[PDB]
Ligand binder design. Structure first.
Ligand SMILES: [Ca+2]
Ligand SMILES: [Ca+2]
Ligand SMILES: [Ca+2]
Ligand SMILES: [Ca+2]
Lengths: 637, 637
């Protein structure tokens, strides 16, 4: 960067020189009227070129050389090292008329050179490098650069700032700034609700970090200390990307020059760093499980026993919670979503919380707290990593249940949809859930890893599979086999394979629900790049309400606890053939040959009947993806 | 795209097949219980593969082949041509048990194939190509694709729709759609204030085009006609890109299937096109002039005569306007900005209008009608095309005067700043104009082409140049030379070179204003990639007000009429030496050697004095850039 500094007619000029810039200097304006030529001297650490019409020649410290005075003949002044108290850094120009060789006047330029750099970890290694040339930009991808900030999801203490990002103002110079200069750190009004910055204002009095930039504080004057010095700042994000916010914020430092009272200070030098605030990222079922969270009523003993036994087969820990006044019976699944955030060499899990009526588990998590049933997190899923038509989605894609565009049906609130879109790295896809009374994608689909491989399966509810199985068992002589054995509140209904197959309206309803399932099947194959070999159909059956929407006839087996090879599958209570549930046997026959281990989990016996509602919930916290989100290259919007 | 269509147990299935998709068909669900194998027949124009575990084999129209019934053995059904009335397109599956070789049941699939494509000119040649594979995306650059829409800047007539973009729904099929289907064109609620779509609903009754999509209309059912048919739609943009609007809009067509009363229709097939709305683009001084617009009082005869004479030296036309009650005296410069919009094979000039208190020239223009003095268009300029550190700005960069970030000074309204930023193709830069009372960048800088070359110069006001010239003329014995000769209302002041040079406070004021000019010089060199060889300094002088802001002491010569080589330059009324103005002679000596022709234009004599205010304005309409804006690749935000 070239900066204009003119010599002054009939006076000396004193200026600060910031390393990394250079000066172009007009010597002609300061020349007395009638002066013809000029010469110059300069000090050891100041480099001077005489530039005429673009042609530059280096000039010695004390030569006698003279040049014609012209508006097109100027100086270029460069310094490569900061001034110390030993410095006298200067350039002196002498002017001559035609008459003789003794100077008729002189104009000086006295310089104080300083280094000023606002530094961040732009190369994303966890260290703060010196003046990364790319620090004022933010680029995506493996070769991309620019610094990353985490949202704070939780007088100040340094330990409290441990999770924040470091920003270091590095300076070099003499004991003090020359008269009339100050250094100021600042942000825009717009960014003031996106960030906060902390600094120890008075280090002689202790280590106390105070908030110096943020809401209502757009600038802070910082003290200059001499020699080589560093000022350490900690930076936090205040919010995630959203509809009106890209995730990018900027922080500036300027060297300001005092002009006079009532006049603004002049920005002599400005340095800028950019941060991107890390997005919230959801974890698919294929990622390693860490902890399993379940909620249920305190007396559902079978559920607790069976979930405990399932988890004991794994390296996961179990966390048990009971029911609350302000939450639904499924709240750990419906009102809580486990996700994570990551910055170089720091990250943690972050839970989204949307309480029904408005506790937590552990200090290890960050928390983000915020209508129809489509707003529930049961209506959010995320796929495993996929490649679709050559486009990679290394973090998978978020799936959100919705209705058809022209339907006038239900949709997840725009605030949440827009939030998920703005995170960008999971590129959300809308599915069709509004054919279900509750309206959650987890009622009809799930993903499971295939043991021993890097691959996965999509599991889909299928009414066609159920009708085929029941028709087969009827042909085999099992028509009188009863559903819901052991549920006493169902017994009077005497539900058998025969009774189901002869119910004409229920057949028609389920053909329609299969069309709904198949519409989703097609979107999933398109948007996830799946073929029929990637899909397994689990038998399912629904009843229709007055709104023509579906509720489960028997428990939906697709919404299962996935711990690697081990699957907790809701107990279906299907027709018994040879004293085994034919639904359990059929599901084992589909899954077990792939190395999946099935355990059926009974959450409904404690209620004595099944009306389509599930009274328990589970959620699994998983390890984050190995792939760093900042290595993705999302499509430009 | 693969689409799920299942055969139905104990019933025939009839389906529409859309060309460009194919069907996967489950034959297992429709099989009677206990059935073992299946065979199939199909018609001539339906292609059928039997797919087992991913392995596909083509099957003849009538063979006897049998396959084992398995959930993992399915059909893939393809059609390459639309159905006609001569068509019977079908696949029939027969089922067998173990007992014998006569079919025990049969399931049919009856098909009607149609072509449906919503087509736009995505390859940007002005024609609407058939089904551009990239039509649902919009990409920048020479190799980029996707369709372009113009904002409308002005029952309907086809002639009135001439400037709009064409969109054509192309179909092929038999006489009618099968029972229970319709075709619907639609847009999102969000896009409904961004676009409008016109169509002839009833072509048997006339050519009347009606508005079918837009505000309050999100969908339109379109009539299907048989054979090969085209429906022509015209599309308009309603607004330019802005802070909350990228410029992209989408239009969809869906084939919908009727399910039953009270249930939404199913979207069987959907096709999407995207448009980008063309940005508003400003024209720099280097572009060829077309028309010169001037405004002044009716009796400023010298101004009119001299502007007429200047324009007569060129191929430009002159348009003269007088003063209005609702506008400032400079309104043609201050309240009007000439720009343009362009789409493939269509474009026109578009004027931004911001009246002071709230006419036009010509049908040839589009008009966009909308506070401090920084809101004036005198405070907007645009640079010639530049390359900065390897980054090209083929349309130049917009320049907007502002104050320093921490100053608490004036700034152009956010609405206008955000508008200019959102157009993206001119990548705006803020300068510092708030040191001027009026606060307009055109008070201190301008660009001019260098005759005979592809290059240009930045012209900067310079107080240092004025003081140097005046000190020289004083040394030469001209100190008593008077300013403002012929302006009778100035005479009593007896302003001479001596009086100016001896005014100590004015010297100090102008040293400060030179610092302001130099701060801008540095930003311009940085952001436009300019060196000192690209800049000429014109003598200027200012007086300071109570706010420490500048007004011209004598007319600012930098704000000039630029018609290629011919420059209309405000007459300065400088000190007379040998009966010529020394300011005019100095300016000629700078410009004329470069092949620029200078004419001094007197707009102030009719007022008898000069107080810092200019009472006339000029604006030049220019030819658009040859470079197409859609070939640029702007930085991603
Ligand atoms: Ca680093
Ligand atoms: Ca979920
Ligand atoms: Ca075309
Ligand atoms: Ca302008």
């Amino acid at each position: 960067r070239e900066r204009t500094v003119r010599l002054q007619y009939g006076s000396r000029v004193e200026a600060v020189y910031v390393l990394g810039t250079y000066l172009w200097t007009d010597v002609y304006s300061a020349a007395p009227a009638g002066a013809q030529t000029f010469s110059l001297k300069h000090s050891e650490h100041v480099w001077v070129e005489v530039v005429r019409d673009g042609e530059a020649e280096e000039v010695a410290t004390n030569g006698k050389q003279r040049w014609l005075l012209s508006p097109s003949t100027t100086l270029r002044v460069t310094m490569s090292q900061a001034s110390t108290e030993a410095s006298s850094d200067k350039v002196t120009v002498n002017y001559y008329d035609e008459e003789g060789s003794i100077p008729i006047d002189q104009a000086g330029l006295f310089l104080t050179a300083i280094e000023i750099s606002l530094d961040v970890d732009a190369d994303r290694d966890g260290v703060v490098e010196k003046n990364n040339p790319k620090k004022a930009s933010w680029t995506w991808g493996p070769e991309g650069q620019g610094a990353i900030l985490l949202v704070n999801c939780d007088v100040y203490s340094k330990e409290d700032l441990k999770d924040m990002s470091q920003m270091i103002l590095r300076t070099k110079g003499p004991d003090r700034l020359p008269a009339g200069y100050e250094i100021v750190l600042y942000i825009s009004m717009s960014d003031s609700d996106k960030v906060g910055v902390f600094y120890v204002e008075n280090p002689f009095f202790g280590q106390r970090y105070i908030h110096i930039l943020g809401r209502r504080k757009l600038y802070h004057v910082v003290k200059y200390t001499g020699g080589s010095a560093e000022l350490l700042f900690f930076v936090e994000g205040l919010c995630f990307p959203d509809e009106g916010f890209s995730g990018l914020v900027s922080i500036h430092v300027s060297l300001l020059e005092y002009m006079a009272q009532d006049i603004p200070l002049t920005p002599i030098f400005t340095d800028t760093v950019i941060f991107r605030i890390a997005p919230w990222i959801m974890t698919p079922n294929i990622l390693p499980p860490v902890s399993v969270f379940v909620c249920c009523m305190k007396d559902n003993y079978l559920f607790l026993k069976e979930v405990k036994n399932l988890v004991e087969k794994t390296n996961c820990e179990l966390k048990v919670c009971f029911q609350y006044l302000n939450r639904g019976d499924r709240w750990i699944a419906d009102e809580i979503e486990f996700g994570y955030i990551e910055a170089p060499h720091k990250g943690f899990p972050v839970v989204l919380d949307s309480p029904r009526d408005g506790e937590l588990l552990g200090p290890d998590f960050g928390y983000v707290t915020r209508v129809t049933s489509l707003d529930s997190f049961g209506n959010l899923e995320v796929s495993p990593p996929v490649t679709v038509n050559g486009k990679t989605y290394p973090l998978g894609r978020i799936l959100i249940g919705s209705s058809f565009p022209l339907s006038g049906g239900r949709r997840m609130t725009k605030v949440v949809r827009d939030f998920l879109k703005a995170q960008q790295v999971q590129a959300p896809v809308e599915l069709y859930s509004d054919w279900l009374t509750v309206g959650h994608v987890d009622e009809f689909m799930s993903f499971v890893p295939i043991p021993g491989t890097k691959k996965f399966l999509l599991l889909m509810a299928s009414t066609s599979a159920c009708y085929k199985l029941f028709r087969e068992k009827q042909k085999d002589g099992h028509g009188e086999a009863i559903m819901f054995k052991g549920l006493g509140g169902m017994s009077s209904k005497r539900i058998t394979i025969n009774k189901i197959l002869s119910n004409e309206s229920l057949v028609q309803e389920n053909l329609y629900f299969q069309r709904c399932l198949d519409w989703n099947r097609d979107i999933l194959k398109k948007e996830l790049g799946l073929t029929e070999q990637d899909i397994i159909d689990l038998p399912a059956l629904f009843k229709m309400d007055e709104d023509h929407r579906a509720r489960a006839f028997f428990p939906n087996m697709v919404n299962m606890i996935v711990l690697d090879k081990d699957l907790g599958i809701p107990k279906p209570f299907g027709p018994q053939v040879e004293e085994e549930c034919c639904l359990e046997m059929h599901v084992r026959g589909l899954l077990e040959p792939l190395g999946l281990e099935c355990t059926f989990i009974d959450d409904i016996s404690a209620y004595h009947k099944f009306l389509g509602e599930v009274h328990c919930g589970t959620n699994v916290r998983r390890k984050p993806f190995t792939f760093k989100w900042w290595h993705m290259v999302p499509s430009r919007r």
